[PDB]
Design a protein around this ligand. Structure first.
Ligand SMILES: *[C@@H]1O[C@H](CO)[C@@H](O[C@@H]2O[C@H](CO)[C@@H](O[C@@H]3O[C@H](CO[C@H]4O[C@H](CO)[C@@H](O)[C@H](O)[C@@H]4O)[C@@H](O)[C@H](O[C@H]4O[C@H](CO)[C@@H](O)[C@H](O)[C@@H]4O)[C@@H]3O)[C@H](O)[C@H]2NC(C)=O)[C@H](O)[C@H]1NC(C)=O
Ligand SMILES: *[C@@H]1O[C@H](CO)[C@@H](O[C@@H]2O[C@H](CO)[C@@H](O[C@@H]3O[C@H](CO[C@H]4O[C@H](CO)[C@@H](O)[C@H](O)[C@@H]4O)[C@@H](O)[C@H](O[C@H]4O[C@H](CO)[C@@H](O)[C@H](O)[C@@H]4O)[C@@H]3O)[C@H](O)[C@H]2NC(C)=O)[C@H](O)[C@H]1NC(C)=O
Ligand SMILES: *[C@@H]1O[C@H](CO)[C@@H](O[C@@H]2O[C@H](CO)[C@@H](O[C@@H]3O[C@H](CO[C@H]4O[C@H](CO)[C@@H](O)[C@H](O)[C@@H]4O)[C@@H](O)[C@H](O[C@H]4O[C@H](CO)[C@@H](O)[C@H](O)[C@@H]4O)[C@@H]3O)[C@H](O)[C@H]2NC(C)=O)[C@H](O)[C@H]1NC(C)=O
Ligand SMILES: CC(=O)N[C@H]1[C@H](O[C@@H]2[C@@H](O)[C@H](O)O[C@H](CO)[C@@H]2O)O[C@H](CO)[C@@H](O[C@@H]2O[C@H](CO)[C@H](O)[C@H](O[C@]3(C(=O)O)C[C@H](O)[C@@H](NC(C)=O)[C@H]([C@H](O)[C@H](O)CO)O3)[C@H]2O)[C@@H]1O
Ligand SMILES: CC(=O)N[C@H]1[C@H](O[C@@H]2[C@@H](O)[C@H](O)O[C@H](CO)[C@@H]2O)O[C@H](CO)[C@@H](O[C@@H]2O[C@H](CO)[C@H](O)[C@H](O[C@]3(C(=O)O)C[C@H](O)[C@@H](NC(C)=O)[C@H]([C@H](O)[C@H](O)CO)O3)[C@H]2O)[C@@H]1O
Ligand SMILES: CC(=O)N[C@H]1[C@H](O[C@@H]2[C@@H](O)[C@H](O)O[C@H](CO)[C@@H]2O)O[C@H](CO)[C@@H](O[C@@H]2O[C@H](CO)[C@H](O)[C@H](O[C@]3(C(=O)O)C[C@H](O)[C@@H](NC(C)=O)[C@H]([C@H](O)[C@H](O)CO)O3)[C@H]2O)[C@@H]1O
Ligand SMILES: *[C@@H]1O[C@H](CO)[C@@H](O[C@@H]2O[C@H](CO)[C@@H](O[C@@H]3O[C@H](CO)[C@@H](O)[C@H](O[C@H]4O[C@H](CO)[C@@H](O)[C@H](O)[C@@H]4O)[C@@H]3O)[C@H](O)[C@H]2NC(C)=O)[C@H](O)[C@H]1NC(C)=O
Ligand SMILES: *[C@@H]1O[C@H](CO)[C@@H](O[C@@H]2O[C@H](CO)[C@@H](O[C@@H]3O[C@H](CO)[C@@H](O)[C@H](O[C@H]4O[C@H](CO)[C@@H](O)[C@H](O)[C@@H]4O)[C@@H]3O)[C@H](O)[C@H]2NC(C)=O)[C@H](O)[C@H]1NC(C)=O
Ligand SMILES: *[C@@H]1O[C@H](CO)[C@@H](O[C@@H]2O[C@H](CO)[C@@H](O[C@@H]3O[C@H](CO)[C@@H](O)[C@H](O[C@H]4O[C@H](CO)[C@@H](O)[C@H](O)[C@@H]4O)[C@@H]3O)[C@H](O)[C@H]2NC(C)=O)[C@H](O)[C@H]1NC(C)=O
Ligand SMILES: *[C@@H]1O[C@H](CO)[C@@H](O[C@@H]2O[C@H](CO)[C@@H](O)[C@H](O)[C@H]2NC(C)=O)[C@H](O)[C@H]1NC(C)=O
Ligand SMILES: *[C@@H]1O[C@H](CO)[C@@H](O)[C@H](O)[C@H]1NC(C)=O
Ligand SMILES: *[C@@H]1O[C@H](CO)[C@@H](O)[C@H](O)[C@H]1NC(C)=O
Ligand SMILES: *[C@@H]1O[C@H](CO)[C@@H](O)[C@H](O)[C@H]1NC(C)=O
Ligand SMILES: *[C@@H]1O[C@H](CO)[C@@H](O)[C@H](O)[C@H]1NC(C)=O
Lengths: 317, 169, 317, 169, 169, 317
């Protein structure tokens, strides 16, 4: 009679379908998912330093909008801007807003050092009902609204050397009065001019008088500019009117910092990978949660699922 | 009657991925082969370790959603991102297809290796039934079957008996 | 004697060469081409809505060049601009022409709604011999050339609220007179200014007086600008001269529309994939016809041919 | 004399991709094997269905030809497009090389599978001539050859005759 | 005792990649097989010729290092380049892994092909010892061994002797 | 007794580790490196035409800084700018410097043709102590500093047609005086204006009077602009003061030329692939020397090594 000896392999009743080169669908004994498709719906506060902008855009925290005073000098790995954020100070715009926002975000610090600019012969610390701070008329914390004194506005020609070992970022602006009358009432003379220069740059701005739609009852505007001053260089401000002067400089750092638009709440938890939807686990190589990411993250793909076989072909009995 | 790996798997083998079923004069049984099982598992763990927990840090990038219409610069930012996503999506699709092909090939390979190894132990003393099974032409008790499974089977011990059985009319 | 039984496979007398990993060239029994290398030399009018620009650029159709009157209010999936197209109205330029062209192209509509701007105290509907419509001096259909009335140009300060559920696109401009004389003759006063603003934007333009080379006998120029007004916002035009005023707004849509430069004729046929050379079949995964495509198209590659084996190795007898 | 698949194909087999040639006491002939043929064809159709008629819609993109010199922005637009085209061209080249490798492997595999299947039917009754052919050591008429081709051949019917022929001096 | 390719290579074979060791009544020796050796080498040279000396010319591109902070445009230039480098780095990693897999497979394949070819020459006259070696059951002097290595061995010459040896008790 | 015949393969005592799909590390008999990781530390002068900028940026060679006179009319495949380069003429800036640098670099030629502009009623060939040439006050070689003559600056209105078969590149500028006094002393009238136009373009520039930090004792600045004039078009310069006039045009070519920042010395040798570190061999498909390359170069990757197996698995005895 003898014996019979048969070689075989296992099989399972509940197999899973995968794709190979040979087959669009083949059942295997087991598989694992390579596409992360869910977030936990909150941005974990660890291990990255999160700064929740709350009602403040980064630019409003920079200029010093009154509701953003709590942000002075803070640092971040990720600044989170909320869709509800709104400005509540003198109405302004920033030509190339997106670039100023990007470079501050990437710098990752609001550290500000005050400097003593020699502003002789003008009225300082101008304020407005459009920018209320603790019940009083006020202004952007980091800017100095200069106007005429004793019906005169003597031409400004002020220098600030950078004798530090780091770059200085200066934020300044131009007031665009609503009428030719207001130009006179504020600055003495019928047309202002601003020239801000260094050894390696110059920026020249002329105000544009006129009506804009009222924002917090103000039909005029401020336009914001910026200037970087390297070590051994000099800021030179030369102006016959309309200057919204800097009070000092922001430190500008380089590193890994960024900014993200999200309405997800901040949670007390620890997760490497952040998306606008919330933190996501980063065990899988791919993800279809969001193309916007910060940190050690799976790569964004369009597939909602990719199954990697972790067992042999399943051939039920 | 018992049957081999060509045409089906064994749902009743729960303690291994590959193994042996036998019929002899002491009964019928099953035993997992741990070496072949482990060889497949190690390779699959090898893949998993390359693909899992290996993400790449990125920090400040470009914007990818826009509240206002702008034209040229925004067209470019969008096209750069779309381009990138399509290329990664392609890489992911191909990678999984190639990996899964290789997994099916390596797991099929361990089955074939175990079969061939068994065939080469038995030699002369058995016939390949074409279905993953061997007909062994000598008395082969549980210890004998065990010796085949453990790679200690000496075909010379049974050769006389086996040939006498095969080549009688 | 017995028998002999041999196993074999087919072979063909006319095999084809393919590339594998193992071999740079191996003959197989059959192959298929994966690179589409030809067009039918015409752009099929189906299934995409084609708008043939003929003598008109999209921007000339937008502004309302007299030869483009037929285009009023039309929509497209693909606007086709011809190399022969030429302007035939007041000579103009568009700072960031490429962006205005892109955003209208992508919007996919020339739908225009007239509005009643309060232009009191000026002469309206200015025209020129540079822009002939049905034998008479004329102007861009969608723009209103305002000039002095009774030797006066009273400052304009006009509002237009957007109370719709969609965005409004306004096209307007500035006339740059050839001489200081002409500045006076047209606008009363020696220097014009234009300020166009919303709650979220402002644009200020000063004309630049001077000679440019004559185009249709005109040595002056118009420069074109645009402004988007969202729902609940307001257009505010404030000007002391030189304004080329809007007559209303274009609807701005989002969707799948585009623009393509091509001289291929439009044909009565149906093809998904369009290139500048003409429509191409889209059965193959790749193509080397043109990097510029619209629709469901094969991907552009540099290879002129890629052969996919569809049979076994060919081993002749 | 007839010869197997090692070293050449058969231009005269027009009704199948794989098959059998025989010589016996009733003559010489050829027959296609439809199963192996179909297995190869189905796999190749599988590939084709993944690659053919599967294009991707794109709409408004960036400009790719320029009538004026501009510098920085145009340099970037051009570099983005060149980058993209080179990456797709690479993907296309690799994909076709891998696909074609796999096609040659799967078609070679069906030949080997058919040969092995035949070997395992004949067993004991035939010798592998090393050239894709078997010498069958018993009378095997057209019905017998047919039974091998159809997988209904019982080697036990001919074993006595076959062994008697092989192991005579 | 001499041993085959299953479980180790031969550091003493310096004149070929694949070959034969024998023991007979004239002694013990080694000989390289030039055909199998050359088949592997040609394939590897084939790969090398596709990858070596095949670079691509590029000329004016985008800037990739920046002395000043600029924001949006620079963010985009940087992201485009980072994107490109990551995609090429991935292509390089995959390509080398796939190429190296294929090299190991093609070199293993030439070993298996040589073994099978030898098995099919010997047939009936030898037994596969399961370790890459054959026990040949007839006197096989240096000329005989040579005839196996050269593919001119006729098993019919030795069959009577060989079977007489194998199937005696 | 019989014989024994064993099949085998070679093995080596010194194998190398490679990666496959099956294994993260497997020892093979031999491998070759696919990542070029070294340069020879010099830029070979063959087979590409190298132009070493030495103390000159490309823009300074273009404008004609006195230390760059040796560069007149030269061509290159690759212009190499050195980190030590410095300007030594009238202090200037170029709005969109990066674009002018790119387009000249890509053009690959400094060929300049002088033209006779009709500058009647002004003083020509203005010079400065900031720009010394052979011990005398001088100016940019390719620019003509025009100032008042006999206390008058008669308005300029000068034409230059392009009757050639190629494009002309014109470089010109605007002088920004330090004070309103100097505006008068140099140009007669209290405000200058420049309008440079063609049939297809216009550029209007107003000087901005003011102090900038001193460079070579000069607190004023020049701002540089450019204009391309196609065949059959016309350059039209219309100016009432402050024009830094062109002396002619640069030829503008298209081809394979570029510019590279490097401090590597130029060597007498022959190498196809150039990086900032020096020339690199181009036998390997990849390289991790530099992402910046010119010529037939391996592709930049992040890996420092990629080993391609060139032999079988190594299994020692
Ligand atoms: C050039 O064109 C622009 C655009 O139209 C004109 O700008 C308008 O100017 C008028 C007059 O200065 C502005 O009207 C004022 O609005 C203020 C803000 O009101 C807000 O809150 C109320 C709720 O009570 C809302 O209804 C309203 O929508 C606003 O959100 C008021 O504070 C002002 O009130 C004054 O007048 C009323 C009576 O009319 C009195 O009862 C008050 O006590 C007070 O004296 C006033 O109503 C209007 O807002 C401006 N529009 C825009 C879009 O900015 C310029 O005036 C015009 N220039 C010239 C020179 O003509
Ligand atoms: C500042 O500098 C600019 C640039 O040179 C000057 O612009 C030129 O101005 C002159 C005079 O106004 C222009 O000349 C005029 O050209 C008109 C168009 O002619 C076209 O058609 C004819 C065919 O007949 C072609 O030959 C020609 O090339 C054009 O395509 C004519 O209609 C005008 O004709 C008048 O004069 C002639 C006699 O000279 C009479 O017969 C006519 O009846 C008629 O009165 C005239 O010829 C010239 O085109 C302008 N050039 C450019 C490039 O625009 C400015 O004049 C100058 N400013 C100052 C203040 O000096
Ligand atoms: C608006 O604000 C700006 C910014 O401060 C002022 O610009 C300064 O103007 C002053 C006066 O014109 C400049 O001072 C001059 O510097 C020249 C260059 O000196 C260089 O070399 C010396 C070495 O000897 C270095 O120490 C120095 O750092 C420079 O590198 C000198 O040549 C001038 O010398 C004159 O004065 C001295 C005595 O003070 C005499 O001994 C000399 O003979 C000679 O007469 C002078 O020192 C200064 O450089 C400017 N600063 C900048 C940053 O540009 C504007 O003046 C101001 N405008 C108004 C209207 O007030
Ligand atoms: C009806 C109207 O328009 N009235 C405004 C006035 O216009 C006159 C018209 O009434 C009249 O019909 O026609 C006249 C011509 O003949 C006039 O055009 O113009 C003044 C401005 O000059 C308006 O007053 C302003 O109203 C503001 C309300 O939002 C506010 O009260 C302004 O005061 C502040 C402020 O808080 O914003 C006071 C600040 O201390 C001051 N800061 C500084 C540093 O000077 C600012 C600042 O001057 C402005 O913000 C600059 O734009 O103003 C008040 O001046 C009047 O409503
Ligand atoms: C020789 C010459 O340059 N002549 C032009 C004249 O210049 C004088 C010189 O002849 C003389 O040597 O020196 C003088 C100084 O002492 C003068 O500079 O200037 C006038 C313009 O003021 C020229 O007349 C214009 O010629 C046009 C021909 O292409 C055309 O006929 C102009 O009329 C229209 C037009 O159709 O373009 C008439 C339109 O109704 C009018 N529209 C409006 C809304 O007002 C336009 C518009 O005024 C202009 O297009 C604005 O740039 O003009 C005609 O005014 C003369 O040739
Ligand atoms: C102390 C001072 O600032 N002095 C400068 C003078 O300012 C006066 C002050 O001293 C005084 O305290 O207050 C006064 C007001 O009441 C004055 O503001 O202004 C003059 C310029 O007008 C300065 O002289 C210039 O110094 C230069 C030294 O770097 C140089 O010598 C200038 O001459 C050239 C030059 O080489 O750069 C001579 C060239 O031939 C000339 N070229 C042309 C084509 O005209 C140039 C050119 O005029 C300027 O470069 C234009 O910016 O100037 C010399 O004019 C004095 O130091
Ligand atoms: C950069 O800074 C410098 C230095 O501060 C600055 O120069 C100054 O310019 C002002 C304004 O032009 C000068 O003051 C004027 O001097 C001229 C000289 O003739 C007069 O015409 C002016 O008189 C008018 O304005 C007076 C104002 O009250 C009226 O009283 C008179 O009736 C006239 O309307 C006026 O006095 C000043 O002299 C210089 N300062 C020095 C030290 O030279 C320059 O303007 C600044 N540049 C910019 C772009 O801001
Ligand atoms: C935005 O719109 C507002 C509102 O329309 C507008 O304000 C207006 O400005 C004009 C021009 O400046 C004003 O008219 C002037 O009033 C001043 C007041 O002193 C006078 O100096 C002017 O006189 C000169 O011009 C007259 C023209 O005929 C001559 O007769 C005289 O001899 C002088 O040369 C002139 O009368 C007008 O009063 C205001 N309107 C109101 C309601 O306040 C503003 O200009 C616009 N802004 C822009 C940027 O367009
Ligand atoms: C482009 O080129 C054209 C042609 O050259 C040019 O036109 C010229 O403009 C100048 C400056 O405006 C004109 O000269 C003026 O003519 C007017 C006419 O009333 C006068 O008001 C001016 O007088 C003042 O300046 C004189 C200077 O000495 C003083 O003596 C006098 O007291 C006044 O202060 C002055 O004479 C000139 O007539 C025209 N030329 C022609 C042929 O028409 C235009 O300016 C240029 N455009 C640009 C943007 O540069
Ligand atoms: C489709 O059109 C493109 C663009 O016009 C053609 O490519 C050009 O071909 C001409 C003539 O050979 C060359 O001089 C240009 O350099 C090419 N341009 C580009 C951008 O590559 C292409 O040949 C056409 N293809 C077909 C199939 O008609
Ligand atoms: C085979 O190994 C198993 C290990 O559990 C052992 O139980 C059995 O007795 C062994 N038999 C032989 C013949 O080696
Ligand atoms: C070979 O020839 C036949 C008949 O002419 C043709 O139909 C077939 O397409 C050809 N095949 C190849 C791969 O060239
Ligand atoms: C084999 O199958 C074919 C099908 O056409 C049939 O003609 C033949 O008789 C069959 N022979 C046997 C022995 O099953
Ligand atoms: C085998 O070939 C080798 C070639 O060197 C030769 O020396 C040997 O004699 C040959 N032997 C036979 C039996 O063909």
């Amino acid at each position: 009679p003898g014996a019979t000896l048969c070689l075989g392999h296992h099989a399972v009743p509940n197999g899973t379908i995968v794709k190979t080169i040979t087959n669009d669908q083949i059942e295997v004994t087991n598989a694992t998912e390579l596409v992360q498709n869910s977030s936990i719906g909150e941005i974990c506060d660890s291990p990255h330093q999160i700064l929740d902008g709350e009602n403040c855009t980064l630019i409003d925290a920079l200029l010093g909008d009154p509701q953003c005073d709590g942000f002075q000098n803070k640092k971040w790995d990720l600044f989170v801007e909320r869709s509800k954020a709104y400005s509540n100070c003198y109405p302004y715009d920033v030509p190339d807003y997106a670039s100023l926002r990007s470079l501050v975000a990437s710098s990752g610090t609001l550290e500000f050092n005050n400097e003593s600019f020699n502003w002789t012969g003008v009225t300082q610390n101008g304020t407005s009902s459009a920018c209320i701070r603790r019940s009083n008329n006020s202004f952007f914390s980091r800017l100095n609204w200069l106007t005429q004194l004793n019906f005169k506005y003597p031409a400004l020609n002020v220098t600030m050397p950078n004798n530090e070992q780091f770059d200085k970022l200066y934020i300044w602006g131009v007031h665009h009065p609503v009428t030719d009358k207001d130009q006179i009432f504020l600055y003495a003379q019928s047309s202002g001019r601003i020239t801000v220069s260094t050894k390696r740059s110059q920026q020249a701005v002329i105000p544009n008088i006129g009506y804009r739609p009222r924002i917090r009852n103000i039909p005029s505007r401020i336009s914001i500019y910026w200037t970087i001053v390297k070590p051994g260089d000099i800021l030179l401000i030369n102006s016959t009117g309309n200057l919204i002067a800097p009070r000092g400089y922001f430190k500008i750092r380089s590193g890994k910092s960024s900014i993200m638009r999200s309405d997800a709440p901040i949670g007390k938890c620890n997760s490497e990978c952040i998306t606008p939807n919330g933190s996501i686990p980063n065990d899988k190589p791919f993800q279809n949660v969001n193309r916007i990411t910060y940190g050690a993250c799976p790569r964004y793909v369009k597939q909602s699922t990719l199954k990697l076989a972790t067992g042999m072909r399943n051939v039920p009995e | 009657a018992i049957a081999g790996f060509i045409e089906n798997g064994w749902e009743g083998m729960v303690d291994g991925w590959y193994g042996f079923r036998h019929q002899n004069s002491e009964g019928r049984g099953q035993a997992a082969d741990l070496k072949s099982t482990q060889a497949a598992i190690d390779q699959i763990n090898g893949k998993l370790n390359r693909l899992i927990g290996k993400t790449n840090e990125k920090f400040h990038q470009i914007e990818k959603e826009f509240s206002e219409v702008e034209g040229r610069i925004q067209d470019l930012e969008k096209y750069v991102e779309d381009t990138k996503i399509d290329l990664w999506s392609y890489n992911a699709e191909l990678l999984v297809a190639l990996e899964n092909q290789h997994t099916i090939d390596l797991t099929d390979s361990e089955m074939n290796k175990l079969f061939e190894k068994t065939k080469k132990q038995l030699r002369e003393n058995a016939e390949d039934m074409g279905n993953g099974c061997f007909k062994i032409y000598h008395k082969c008790d549980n210890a004998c079957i065990g010796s085949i499974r453990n790679g200690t089977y000496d075909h010379d011990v049974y050769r006389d008996e086996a040939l006498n059985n095969r080549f009688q009319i």
